[PDB]
Tab-separated table of C-alpha atoms and ligand atoms in Angstrom:
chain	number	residue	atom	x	y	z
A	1	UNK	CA	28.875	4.064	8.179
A	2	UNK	CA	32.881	4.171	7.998
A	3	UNK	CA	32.722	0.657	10.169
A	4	UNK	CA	33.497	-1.637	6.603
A	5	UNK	CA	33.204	-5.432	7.447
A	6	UNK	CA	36.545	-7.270	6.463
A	7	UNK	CA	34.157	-9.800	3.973
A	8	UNK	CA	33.588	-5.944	2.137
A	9	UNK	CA	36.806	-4.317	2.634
A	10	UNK	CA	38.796	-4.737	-0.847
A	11	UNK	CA	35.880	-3.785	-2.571
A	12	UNK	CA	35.821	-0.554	-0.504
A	13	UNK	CA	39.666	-0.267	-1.031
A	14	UNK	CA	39.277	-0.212	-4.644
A	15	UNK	CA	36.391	2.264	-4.350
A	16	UNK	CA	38.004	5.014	-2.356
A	17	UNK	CA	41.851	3.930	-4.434
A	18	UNK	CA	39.509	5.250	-7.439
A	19	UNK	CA	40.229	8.509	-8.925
A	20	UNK	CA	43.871	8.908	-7.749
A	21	UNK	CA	42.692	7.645	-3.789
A	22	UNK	CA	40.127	10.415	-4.330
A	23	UNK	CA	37.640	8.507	-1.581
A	24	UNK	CA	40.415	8.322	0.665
A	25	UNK	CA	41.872	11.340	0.203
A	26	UNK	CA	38.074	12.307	1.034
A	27	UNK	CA	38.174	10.671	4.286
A	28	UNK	CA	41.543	12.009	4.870
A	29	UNK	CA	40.124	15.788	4.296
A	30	UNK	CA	37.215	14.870	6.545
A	31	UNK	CA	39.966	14.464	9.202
A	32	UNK	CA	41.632	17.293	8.934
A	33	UNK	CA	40.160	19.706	11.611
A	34	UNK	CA	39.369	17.131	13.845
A	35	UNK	CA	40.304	18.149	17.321
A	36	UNK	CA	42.455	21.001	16.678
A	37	UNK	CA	40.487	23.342	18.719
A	38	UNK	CA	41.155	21.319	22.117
A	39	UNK	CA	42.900	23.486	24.582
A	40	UNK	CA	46.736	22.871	24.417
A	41	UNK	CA	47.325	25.441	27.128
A	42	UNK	CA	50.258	23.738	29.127
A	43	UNK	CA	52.076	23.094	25.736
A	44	UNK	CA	51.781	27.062	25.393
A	45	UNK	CA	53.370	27.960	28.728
A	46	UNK	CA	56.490	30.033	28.320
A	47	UNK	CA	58.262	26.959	30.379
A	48	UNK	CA	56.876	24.012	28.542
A	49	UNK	CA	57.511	25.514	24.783
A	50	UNK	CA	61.176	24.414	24.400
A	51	UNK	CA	60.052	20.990	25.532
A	52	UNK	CA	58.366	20.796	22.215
A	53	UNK	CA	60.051	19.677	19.235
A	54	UNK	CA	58.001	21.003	16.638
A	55	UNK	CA	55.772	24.224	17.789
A	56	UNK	CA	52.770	22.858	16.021
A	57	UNK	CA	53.057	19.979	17.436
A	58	UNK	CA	51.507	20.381	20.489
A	59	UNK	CA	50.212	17.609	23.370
A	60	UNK	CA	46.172	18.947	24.372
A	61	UNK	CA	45.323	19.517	27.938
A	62	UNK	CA	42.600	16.634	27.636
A	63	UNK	CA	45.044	13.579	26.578
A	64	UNK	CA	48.105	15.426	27.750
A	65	UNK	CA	50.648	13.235	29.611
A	66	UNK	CA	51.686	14.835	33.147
A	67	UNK	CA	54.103	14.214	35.157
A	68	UNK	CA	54.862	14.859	38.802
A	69	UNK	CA	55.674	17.985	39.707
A	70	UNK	CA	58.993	18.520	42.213
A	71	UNK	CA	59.198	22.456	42.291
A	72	UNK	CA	56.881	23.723	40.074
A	73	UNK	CA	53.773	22.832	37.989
A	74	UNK	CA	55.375	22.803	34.779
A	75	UNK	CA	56.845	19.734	35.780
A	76	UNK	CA	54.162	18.054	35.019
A	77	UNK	CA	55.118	18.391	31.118
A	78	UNK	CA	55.935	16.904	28.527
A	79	UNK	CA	55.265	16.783	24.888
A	80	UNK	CA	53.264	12.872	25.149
A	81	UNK	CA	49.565	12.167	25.333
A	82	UNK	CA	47.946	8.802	26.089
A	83	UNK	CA	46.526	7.772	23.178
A	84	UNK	CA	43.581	4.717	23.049
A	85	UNK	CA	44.141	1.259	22.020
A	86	UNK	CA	41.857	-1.302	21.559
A	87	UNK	CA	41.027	-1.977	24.385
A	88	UNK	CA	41.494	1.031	26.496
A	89	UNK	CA	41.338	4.890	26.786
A	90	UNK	CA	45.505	4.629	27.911
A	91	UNK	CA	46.656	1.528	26.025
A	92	UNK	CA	49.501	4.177	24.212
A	93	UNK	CA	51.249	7.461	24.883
A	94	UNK	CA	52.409	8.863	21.802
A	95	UNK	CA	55.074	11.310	21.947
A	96	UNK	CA	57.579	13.166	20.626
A	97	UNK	CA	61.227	12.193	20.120
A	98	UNK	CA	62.466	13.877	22.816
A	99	UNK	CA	65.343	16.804	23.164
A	100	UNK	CA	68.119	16.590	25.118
A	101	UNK	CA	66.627	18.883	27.254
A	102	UNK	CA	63.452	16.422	27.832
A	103	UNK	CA	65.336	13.631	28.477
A	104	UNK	CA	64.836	13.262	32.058
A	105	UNK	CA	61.542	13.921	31.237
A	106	UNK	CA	61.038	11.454	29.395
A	107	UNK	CA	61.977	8.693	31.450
A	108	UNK	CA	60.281	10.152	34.397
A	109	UNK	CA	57.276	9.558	31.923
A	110	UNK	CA	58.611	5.759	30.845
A	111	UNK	CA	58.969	5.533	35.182
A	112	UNK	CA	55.787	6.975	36.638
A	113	UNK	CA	53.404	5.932	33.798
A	114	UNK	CA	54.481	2.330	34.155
A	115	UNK	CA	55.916	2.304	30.317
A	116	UNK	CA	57.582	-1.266	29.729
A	117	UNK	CA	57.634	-0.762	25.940
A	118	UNK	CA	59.280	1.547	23.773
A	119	UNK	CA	58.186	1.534	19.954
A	120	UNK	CA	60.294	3.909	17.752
A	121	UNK	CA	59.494	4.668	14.527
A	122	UNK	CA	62.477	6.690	13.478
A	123	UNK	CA	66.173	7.102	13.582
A	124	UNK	CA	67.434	9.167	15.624
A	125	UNK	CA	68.681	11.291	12.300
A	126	UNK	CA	66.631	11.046	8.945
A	127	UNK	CA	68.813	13.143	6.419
A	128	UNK	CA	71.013	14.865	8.085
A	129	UNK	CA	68.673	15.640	10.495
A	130	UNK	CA	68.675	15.134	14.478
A	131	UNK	CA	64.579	13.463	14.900
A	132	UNK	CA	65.367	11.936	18.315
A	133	UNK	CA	67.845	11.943	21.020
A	134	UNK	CA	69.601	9.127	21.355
A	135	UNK	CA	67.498	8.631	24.850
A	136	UNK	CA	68.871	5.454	25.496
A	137	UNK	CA	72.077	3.738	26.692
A	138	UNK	CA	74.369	1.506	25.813
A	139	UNK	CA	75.030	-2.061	28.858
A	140	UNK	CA	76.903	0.991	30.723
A	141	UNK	CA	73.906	2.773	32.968
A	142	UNK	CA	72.752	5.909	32.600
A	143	UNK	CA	71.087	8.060	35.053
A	144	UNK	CA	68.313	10.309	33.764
A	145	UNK	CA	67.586	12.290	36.765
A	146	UNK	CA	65.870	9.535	39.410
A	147	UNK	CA	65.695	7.124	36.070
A	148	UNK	CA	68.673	4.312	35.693
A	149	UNK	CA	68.616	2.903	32.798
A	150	UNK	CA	71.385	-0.049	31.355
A	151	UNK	CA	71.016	-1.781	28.087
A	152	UNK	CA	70.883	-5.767	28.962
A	153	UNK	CA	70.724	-6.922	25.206
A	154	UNK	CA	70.275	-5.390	21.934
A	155	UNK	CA	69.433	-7.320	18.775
A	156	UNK	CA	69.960	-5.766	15.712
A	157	UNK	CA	68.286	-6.630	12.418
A	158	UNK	CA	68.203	-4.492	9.131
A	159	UNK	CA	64.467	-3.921	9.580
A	160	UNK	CA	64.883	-3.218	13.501
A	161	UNK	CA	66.582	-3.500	15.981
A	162	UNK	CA	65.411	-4.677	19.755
A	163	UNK	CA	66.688	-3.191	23.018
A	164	UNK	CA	66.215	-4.387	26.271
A	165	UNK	CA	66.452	-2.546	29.455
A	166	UNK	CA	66.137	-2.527	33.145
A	167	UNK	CA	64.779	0.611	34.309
A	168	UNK	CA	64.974	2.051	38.055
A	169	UNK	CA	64.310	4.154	40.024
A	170	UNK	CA	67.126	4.932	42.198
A	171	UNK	CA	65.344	6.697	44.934
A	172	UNK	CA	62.850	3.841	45.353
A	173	UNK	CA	65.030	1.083	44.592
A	174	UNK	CA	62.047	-0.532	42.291
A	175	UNK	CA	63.099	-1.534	38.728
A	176	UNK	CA	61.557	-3.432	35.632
A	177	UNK	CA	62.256	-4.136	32.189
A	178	UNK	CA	61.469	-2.106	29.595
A	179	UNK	CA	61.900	-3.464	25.734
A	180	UNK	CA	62.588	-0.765	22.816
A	181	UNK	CA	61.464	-1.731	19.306
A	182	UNK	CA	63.287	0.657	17.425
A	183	UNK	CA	61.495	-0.285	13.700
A	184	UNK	CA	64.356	1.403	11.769
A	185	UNK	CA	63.670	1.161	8.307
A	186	UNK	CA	60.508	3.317	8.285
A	187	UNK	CA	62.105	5.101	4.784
A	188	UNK	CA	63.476	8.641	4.700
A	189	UNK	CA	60.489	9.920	2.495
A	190	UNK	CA	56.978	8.607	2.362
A	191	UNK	CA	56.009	5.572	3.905
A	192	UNK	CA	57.335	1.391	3.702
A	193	UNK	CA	56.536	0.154	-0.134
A	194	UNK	CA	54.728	-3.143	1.737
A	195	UNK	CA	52.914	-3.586	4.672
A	196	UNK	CA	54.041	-7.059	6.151
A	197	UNK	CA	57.170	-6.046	8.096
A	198	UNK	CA	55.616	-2.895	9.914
A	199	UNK	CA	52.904	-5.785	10.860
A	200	UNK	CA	55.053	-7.937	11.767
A	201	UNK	CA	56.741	-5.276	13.751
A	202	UNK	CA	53.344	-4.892	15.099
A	203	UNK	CA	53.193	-8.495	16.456
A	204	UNK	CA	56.314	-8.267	18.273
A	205	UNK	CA	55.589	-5.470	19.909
A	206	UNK	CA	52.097	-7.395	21.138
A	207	UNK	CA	54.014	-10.493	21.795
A	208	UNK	CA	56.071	-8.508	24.212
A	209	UNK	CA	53.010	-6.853	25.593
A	210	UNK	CA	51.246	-10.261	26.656
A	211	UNK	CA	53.837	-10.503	29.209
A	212	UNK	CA	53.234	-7.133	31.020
A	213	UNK	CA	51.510	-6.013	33.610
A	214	UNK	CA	47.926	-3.973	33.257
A	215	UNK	CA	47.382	-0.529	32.380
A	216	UNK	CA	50.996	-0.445	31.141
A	217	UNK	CA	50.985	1.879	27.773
A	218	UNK	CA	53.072	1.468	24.870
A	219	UNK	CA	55.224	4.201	24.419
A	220	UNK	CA	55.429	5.154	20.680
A	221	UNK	CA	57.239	7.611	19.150
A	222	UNK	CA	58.802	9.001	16.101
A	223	UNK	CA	59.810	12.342	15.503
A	224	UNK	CA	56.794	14.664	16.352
A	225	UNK	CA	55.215	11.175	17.653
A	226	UNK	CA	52.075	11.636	15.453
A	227	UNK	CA	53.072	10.559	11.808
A	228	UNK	CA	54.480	7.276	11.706
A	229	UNK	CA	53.498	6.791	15.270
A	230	UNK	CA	49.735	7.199	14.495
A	231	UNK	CA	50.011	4.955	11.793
A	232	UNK	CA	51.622	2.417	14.090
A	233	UNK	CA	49.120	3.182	16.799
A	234	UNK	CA	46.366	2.630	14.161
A	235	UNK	CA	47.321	-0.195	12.479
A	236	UNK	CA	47.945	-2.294	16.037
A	237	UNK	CA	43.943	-1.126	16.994
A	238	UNK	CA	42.973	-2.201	13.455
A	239	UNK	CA	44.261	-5.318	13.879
A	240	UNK	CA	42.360	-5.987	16.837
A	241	UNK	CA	39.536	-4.810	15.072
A	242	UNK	CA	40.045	-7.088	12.311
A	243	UNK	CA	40.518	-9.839	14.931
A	244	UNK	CA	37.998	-9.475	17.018
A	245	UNK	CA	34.935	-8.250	15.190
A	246	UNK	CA	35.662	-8.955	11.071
A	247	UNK	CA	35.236	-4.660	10.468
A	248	UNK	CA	37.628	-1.806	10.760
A	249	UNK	CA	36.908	1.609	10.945
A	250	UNK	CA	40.275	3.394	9.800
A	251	UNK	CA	38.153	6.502	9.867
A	252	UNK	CA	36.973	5.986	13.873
A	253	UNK	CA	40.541	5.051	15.015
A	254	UNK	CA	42.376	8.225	13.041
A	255	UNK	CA	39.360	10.819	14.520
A	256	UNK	CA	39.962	9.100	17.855
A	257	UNK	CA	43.651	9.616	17.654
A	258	UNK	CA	43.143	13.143	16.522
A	259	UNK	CA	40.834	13.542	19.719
A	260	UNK	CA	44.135	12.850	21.843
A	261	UNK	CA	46.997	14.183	19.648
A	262	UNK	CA	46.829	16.553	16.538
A	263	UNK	CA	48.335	15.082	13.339
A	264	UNK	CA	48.091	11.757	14.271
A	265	UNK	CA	48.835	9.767	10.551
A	266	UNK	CA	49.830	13.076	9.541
A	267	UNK	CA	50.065	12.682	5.780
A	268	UNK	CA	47.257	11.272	3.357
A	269	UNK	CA	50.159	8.701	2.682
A	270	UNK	CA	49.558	7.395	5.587
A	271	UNK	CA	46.265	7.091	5.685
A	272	UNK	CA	46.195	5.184	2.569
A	273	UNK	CA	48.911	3.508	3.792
A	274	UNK	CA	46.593	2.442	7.033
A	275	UNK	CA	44.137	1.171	4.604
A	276	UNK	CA	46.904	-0.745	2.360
A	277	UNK	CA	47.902	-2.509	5.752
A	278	UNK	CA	44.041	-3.259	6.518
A	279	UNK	CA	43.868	-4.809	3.034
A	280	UNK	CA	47.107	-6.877	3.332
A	281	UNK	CA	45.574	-8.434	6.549
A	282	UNK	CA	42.718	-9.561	5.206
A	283	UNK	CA	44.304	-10.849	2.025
A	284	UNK	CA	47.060	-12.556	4.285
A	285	UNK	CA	43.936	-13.896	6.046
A	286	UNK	CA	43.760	-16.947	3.385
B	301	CL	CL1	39.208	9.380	25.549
């Protein structure tokens, strides 16, 4: 019984806001160990352990993104699993910001698993701090081992800022776009004080998306690719949700996404957050 129809959802809200968000710090809880004991093995090879940026942040052997393999099966890594949507079992990968040392590896991943979208839901440095390579290049290509990839436009706005991108690979001489939402106001500590641009965000990342081809993930990421990147993840199978059958189930989509990546929303902020955003849409649903 965590599927709430939207026609009861505020009164739910209000319920588990009670007590200090005691209810949904409950739920929250209830998430906590969920999938933490799936095998993570090829994150733990000696190889594959500096292509994680956080150590405890670790991609399991179930969901676990792999590449091809040239020379040897570590390869195959890198720190990214495919995370469900809506509407199927590989509708995202979420995955870390990468290093300068996964680079390459990530856009063999944004090459072989047929990524045309890029959401990123950090800055590349949050206080002083280096979250995320600058992966991406200016209108001057950039080759990332087999992977060329040129800026064609970039539209800047406070909230975010839009990329686009032809991607190829050189040895096959086969290209295709590839659009970067790079949501850069995601603030510093905690998470957005409203909902609506995140959402709206949201839509123009699925507005993209209705003009791609099938089985074509979204590629989100933030810094460790399960915080904000969760939430994102979450919010966009909510919506559906919302959409297409008047209930949401917060609780299903966060222990799904922690059956495919650990941490995923990683703070009880943004979990309630999830919920706040759940709320706004049906309020914003006149
Ligand atoms: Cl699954």
């Amino acid at each position: 019984s965590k599927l709430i129809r939207v026609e009861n959802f505020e009164a739910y809200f209000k319920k588990q806001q009670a007590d200090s968000n005691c209810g949904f710090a409950e739920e929250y809880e209830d998430l906590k160990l969920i999938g933490i004991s799936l095998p993570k093995y090829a994150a733990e090879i000696a190889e594959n352990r500096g292509k994680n940026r956080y150590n405890n942040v670790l991609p399991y052997d179930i969901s676990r993104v792999k590449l091809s393999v040239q020379t040897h099966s570590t390869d195959d890594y890198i720190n990214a699993n495919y995370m469900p949507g809506y509407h199927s079992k590989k509708d995202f990968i979420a995955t870390q910001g990468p290093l300068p040392n996964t680079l390459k590896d990530f856009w063999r991943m944004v090459w072989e698993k047929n990524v045309y979208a890029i959401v990123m839901l950090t800055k590349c440095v949050e206080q002083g701090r280096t979250k995320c390579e600058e992966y991406w290049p200016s209108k001057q290509a950039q080759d990332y081992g087999d992977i060329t990839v040129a800026m064609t436009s970039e539209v800047v706005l406070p909230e975010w800022t839009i990329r686009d991108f032809v991607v190829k690979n050189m040895q096959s001489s086969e290209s295709h776009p590839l659009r970067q939402f790079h949501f850069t106001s995601w603030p510093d500590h905690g998470v957005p004080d409203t909902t609506d641009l995140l959402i709206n965000f949201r839509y123009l990342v699925r507005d993209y998306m209705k003009q791609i081809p099938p089985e074509s993930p979204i590629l989100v990421h933030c810094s460790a690719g399960v915080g904000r990147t969760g939430t994102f993840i979450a919010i966009d199978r909510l919506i559906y949700q919302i959409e297409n059958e008047n209930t949401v189930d917060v609780y299903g989509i966060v222990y799904d996404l922690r059956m495919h990546r650990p941490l995923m929303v990683q703070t009880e902020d943004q979990y309630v957050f999830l919920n706040q955003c759940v709320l706004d849409i049906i309020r914003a649903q006149k």
